[PDB]
Amino acid sequence: VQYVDASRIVIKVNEDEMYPGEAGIDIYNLTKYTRSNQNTCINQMPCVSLGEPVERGDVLADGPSTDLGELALGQNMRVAFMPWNGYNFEDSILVSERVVQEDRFTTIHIQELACVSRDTKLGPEEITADIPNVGEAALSKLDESGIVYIGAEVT
Amino acid sequence: ARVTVQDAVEKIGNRFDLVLVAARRARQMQVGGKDPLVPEENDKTTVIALREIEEGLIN
Amino acid sequence: MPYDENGTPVDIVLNPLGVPSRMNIGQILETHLGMAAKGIGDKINAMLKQQ
Amino acid sequence: MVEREEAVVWDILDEVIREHPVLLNRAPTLHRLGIQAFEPVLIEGKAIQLHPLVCAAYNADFDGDQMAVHVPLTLEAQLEARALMMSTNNILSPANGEPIIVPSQDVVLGLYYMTRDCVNAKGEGMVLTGPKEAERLYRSGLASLHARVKVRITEYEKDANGELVAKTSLKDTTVGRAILWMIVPKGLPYSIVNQALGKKAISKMLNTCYRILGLKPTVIFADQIMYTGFAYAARSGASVGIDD
Amino acid sequence: DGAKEAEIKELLKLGDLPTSGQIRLYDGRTGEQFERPVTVGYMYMLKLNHL
Amino acid sequence: DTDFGVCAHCYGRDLARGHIINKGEAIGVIAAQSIGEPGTQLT
Amino acid sequence: TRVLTEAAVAGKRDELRGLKENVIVGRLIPAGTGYAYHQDRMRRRAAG
Amino acid sequence: TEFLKPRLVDIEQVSSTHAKVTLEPLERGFGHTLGNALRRILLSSMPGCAVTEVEIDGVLHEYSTKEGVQEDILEILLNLKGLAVRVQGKDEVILTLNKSGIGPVTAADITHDGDVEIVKPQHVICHLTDENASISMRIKVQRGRGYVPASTRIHSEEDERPIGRLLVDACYSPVERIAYNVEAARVEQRTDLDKLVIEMETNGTIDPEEAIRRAATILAEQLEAFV
Amino acid sequence: FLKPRLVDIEQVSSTHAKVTLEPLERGFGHTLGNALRRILLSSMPGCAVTEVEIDGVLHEYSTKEGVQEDILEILLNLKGLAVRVQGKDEVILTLNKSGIGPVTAADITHDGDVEIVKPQHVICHLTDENASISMRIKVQRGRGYVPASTRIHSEEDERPIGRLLVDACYSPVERIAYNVEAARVEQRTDLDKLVIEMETNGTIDPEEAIRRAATILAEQLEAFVDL
Amino acid sequence: RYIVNEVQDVYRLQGVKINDKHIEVIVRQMLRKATIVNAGSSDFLEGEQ
């Protein structure tokens, strides 16, 4: 591996398999916390650390529901079988506060909100750049353009 | 302790005329027309008229 | 959490009443080998902290 | 004030809910037994809780039953909820005169483990005069919940014109059945509860308590049962065995 | 033709586990041992996307 | 003998209740649902 | 539209004696809790 | 770090049957650390008094016949096991019961000592039927802690070698039914705390509220070494 | 009731230790056992990094060109960092590093109060040399588990896009069990010894914690002595 | 009485026990109209209430 980052996987390839035509190296840009079909966070994660060669047809990155090239759907831990004060009634499972206290079991749902605009026959639509009858609070979160700064939190 | 109204259906047996009677007494209680006579304990007025059904002074 | 002879808190509690009906037998066998996959880990871990 | 989530209006929230009943309903419901009423309880969360055994009435498991819980605004509907639509009143099916709700299963194995006979019994032979010290024997841990104990159950029977006649009797019962008396209202006799308790036994069991003693005893009795059903279900211990 | 009884038992007894895999746990709210040790272990989960 | 309806007697008492059927209790609709309730069950 | 014709030409005077009817007009049926309600109402109609 | 101070203790009280100590505030796991701890105390160890052993001077058995009482001698033992008695400046006192005559006998015949504190003399023991029947029994009340079943720690009087001491179980804890009831409470904007409602019932000697502070004094004992 | 007292507290490691009390009575080893476990699992002075403002990173869903792991994962390793403090209830550290290498819990600007239990805990790796990362680590001390979700109503106005907030998990303990056995006193019917096993991340001392537990239990004795 | 026997038997294949009161009001419903036989007042064959 030549330059392992989180967003890129630069491989300094061995010459016995490196192309005798314009040398060559392996660059792989990993999907970064993007949106999926089910609006769930998909992110290829760099498993191979810096300072380690690889085999041909081997792996460099994992993805969600997968770990170190192994299909990991959920998580496994200490389970016991006993009807405990109705907390296992009909379908009910009883869980230790530890899971949410660790949040090793949390899903990140990212949402894409398309903004329609651009020229109507009655007014050449711009992306605001100014909001009437309200304060500068609506713009202290936006810029001169009217686009909210990357890194905020809405609700 | 109150949880069932077996007692109430016994007095005004049509189970729906019960609804009629108690409801109206509840509103006289709402409006300061009157006030509760049979001691209440945070009960909304529908429930209080129902106490007057079990005591039997009002039906 | 119900604890064993050692004091390890359990994480999940399920209903035993569904085993005979639903007939989830392979489910419990994987539980024991899963407990065995961690049982051997228990050996390693202790003796590995001892260096 | 609610904009600031001010504690004041949450107390006024207490004034508009603590005795203001609600109606409940599910979408897939096709029957009238699927529309019932209860009293609200302020639970901090996002999901509508319920009394376990009533789910069988709605025929609602835990597979995604989204309920639309309605609010009786008018005086009429509020009383109508607590009247005919009260859970504790429609304890019979309009199809047949049998108790609509039968104790599911978790509850019953708990009491199967209550009234139960096992040959190896710790304290198998002692005597008690009160089901309350029976509590002090198993909930403490010194005795088993199966020991064949001779106890004096001074059971009662409304053989009078409404009065429960006093009749003394001693039974070769098990520890759990003595504790089962702490559950069983006087009016209901110990003879019916000197049985291993099955799903069908406990079915007609609640029905007899109704035809005999009444509805009120039965309602708050089944209530007792629910708590202790799941209670000793935990106290049960024995759950599943590969060796079996 | 997967893991058999004596095969899973060979692994349980290679760690620190008994034949039955029914370990002695005490009540999480009290401390009294659940009569006839409860069957325990590690099960693998699966969370459907129903939130 | 009651036209445009039924008498409490000819009906009875059985329902969720166990008492005399009321004048105002529309048996029509409840009959409908309780015969079609086991509809999902019939095969 | 069938119903239009069906009762329009006959001018069938149905005094709101059915449940379904009572509900589309949003009024208490002469049964249940509207029993004694419409009891006063029925002897107040064409009678008194 | 922040701490809470227990306030608003709405004591729902009824003379002697039960006291229900409503009280706030309890974060997740405190109506537990306390409620179960109390029921543990009330079923296993509560320094009180009770009858340890009773020798029926008449017929030394419990399944045999004593023509005088319609109840059996075994039923007589039941009666004994549950009587709320409480000695004070003594570890053990022996008393006597002497009744003769036709009638349902009350507990007004057992000797009242400066130590012996029979709370309810109206307590009907044995139902004496036809003809006098000179029954006499030596009831042995002792000071104990919790509950001691006469079966492992037995005395060598006339029961281990001879047969005559119809040993009873000493209900040292003057309680009947114990049950903690945790429920969702709220400190206005706060998430759900627990409004611990403790339904506790005592038989007669000790009154509900004093028992709560008596056990509290015993709980004080338990951590005096720290704070 | 004869009072309990601590015998030698078994201090073996920083990770785990065992407090031990000899003079316990009949069943009180079980009694206080579960009782105190609730205490040691809820009201516990723990430390937890809460705010991590970063030099170049705006949102924890980015990757600084130079750092190895994703920023969100690096922050979960910060949740996995065990540190105890002494006076300050709020303190900020500063990670200053540039050069290829695993950054353990030593390279941070270690404050006098700030004290890591195991400085060998690598948090993140660096793959580039000319990668200057400077981040302020705002850690505070409270108790129990407090998520930024429950704290988002106040929010403290986080308009400045550089503020990253992770969960404040003030939980020192990890695995608690208690060892009950026959106390070997030479003159008494029975007593119980209690060797309370406590597993820790390695930040709060056993006896310090038990006196705190007694203090919390002290508040909890107040009301029940005064009905 | 014939049909209530039969259909109830269907409920026997379902094991459900439902009181025929409801099934019989429905039978009454299906017989609420009747073909007149005698003439004189209205018709000689009117399917009427």
Swiss-Prot record, chain B:
<dbReference type="GO" id="GO:0003677">
    <property type="term" value="F:DNA binding"/>
</dbReference>
<protein>
    <recommendedName>
        <fullName>DNA-directed RNA polymerase subunit omega</fullName>
        <ecNumber>2.7.7.6</ecNumber>
    </recommendedName>
</protein>
<comment type="similarity">
    <text>Belongs to the RNA polymerase subunit omega family.</text>
</comment>
<keyword id="KW-0548">Nucleotidyltransferase</keyword>
<dbReference type="GO" id="GO:0006351">
    <property type="term" value="P:DNA-templated transcription"/>
</dbReference>
<keyword id="KW-0804">Transcription</keyword>
<dbReference type="GO" id="GO:0000428">
    <property type="term" value="C:DNA-directed RNA polymerase complex"/>
</dbReference>
<comment type="subunit">
    <text>The RNAP catalytic core consists of 2 alpha, 1 beta, 1 beta' and 1 omega subunit. When a sigma factor is associated with the core the holoenzyme is formed, which can initiate transcription.</text>
</comment>
<keyword id="KW-0240">DNA-directed RNA polymerase</keyword>
<comment type="function">
    <text>Promotes RNA polymerase assembly. Latches the N- and C-terminal regions of the beta' subunit thereby facilitating its interaction with the beta and alpha subunits.</text>
</comment>
<keyword id="KW-0808">Transferase</keyword>
<dbReference type="GO" id="GO:0003899">
    <property type="term" value="F:DNA-directed RNA polymerase activity"/>
</dbReference>
Curated annotation (Swiss-Prot), chain E:
<comment type="subunit">
    <text>The RNAP catalytic core consists of 2 alpha, 1 beta, 1 beta' and 1 omega subunit. When a sigma factor is associated with the core the holoenzyme is formed, which can initiate transcription.</text>
</comment>
<comment type="function">
    <text>DNA-dependent RNA polymerase catalyzes the transcription of DNA into RNA using the four ribonucleoside triphosphates as substrates.</text>
</comment>
<feature type="modified residue" description="N6-acetyllysine">
    <location>
        <position position="13"/>
    </location>
</feature>
<comment type="similarity">
    <text>Belongs to the RNA polymerase beta chain family.</text>
</comment>
<protein>
    <recommendedName>
        <fullName>DNA-directed RNA polymerase subunit beta</fullName>
    </recommendedName>
</protein>
From Swiss-Prot, chain H:
<keyword id="KW-0240">DNA-directed RNA polymerase</keyword>
<keyword id="KW-0808">Transferase</keyword>
<comment type="function">
    <text>DNA-dependent RNA polymerase catalyzes the transcription of DNA into RNA using the four ribonucleoside triphosphates as substrates.</text>
</comment>
<dbReference type="GO" id="GO:0046983">
    <property type="term" value="F:protein dimerization activity"/>
</dbReference>
<protein>
    <recommendedName>
        <fullName>DNA-directed RNA polymerase subunit alpha</fullName>
        <ecNumber>2.7.7.6</ecNumber>
    </recommendedName>
</protein>
<comment type="similarity">
    <text>Belongs to the RNA polymerase alpha chain family.</text>
</comment>
<dbReference type="GO" id="GO:0003677">
    <property type="term" value="F:DNA binding"/>
</dbReference>
<feature type="region of interest" description="Alpha N-terminal domain (alpha-NTD)">
    <location>
        <begin position="1"/>
        <end position="227"/>
    </location>
</feature>
<dbReference type="GO" id="GO:0005737">
    <property type="term" value="C:cytoplasm"/>
</dbReference>
<keyword id="KW-0548">Nucleotidyltransferase</keyword>
<dbReference type="GO" id="GO:0000428">
    <property type="term" value="C:DNA-directed RNA polymerase complex"/>
</dbReference>
<keyword id="KW-0804">Transcription</keyword>
Curated annotation (Swiss-Prot), chain J:
<comment type="similarity">
    <text>Belongs to the RNA polymerase beta' chain family.</text>
</comment>
<protein>
    <recommendedName>
        <fullName>DNA-directed RNA polymerase subunit beta'</fullName>
    </recommendedName>
</protein>
<comment type="function">
    <text>DNA-dependent RNA polymerase catalyzes the transcription of DNA into RNA using the four ribonucleoside triphosphates as substrates.</text>
</comment>
<comment type="subunit">
    <text>The RNAP catalytic core consists of 2 alpha, 1 beta, 1 beta' and 1 omega subunit. When a sigma factor is associated with the core the holoenzyme is formed, which can initiate transcription.</text>
</comment>
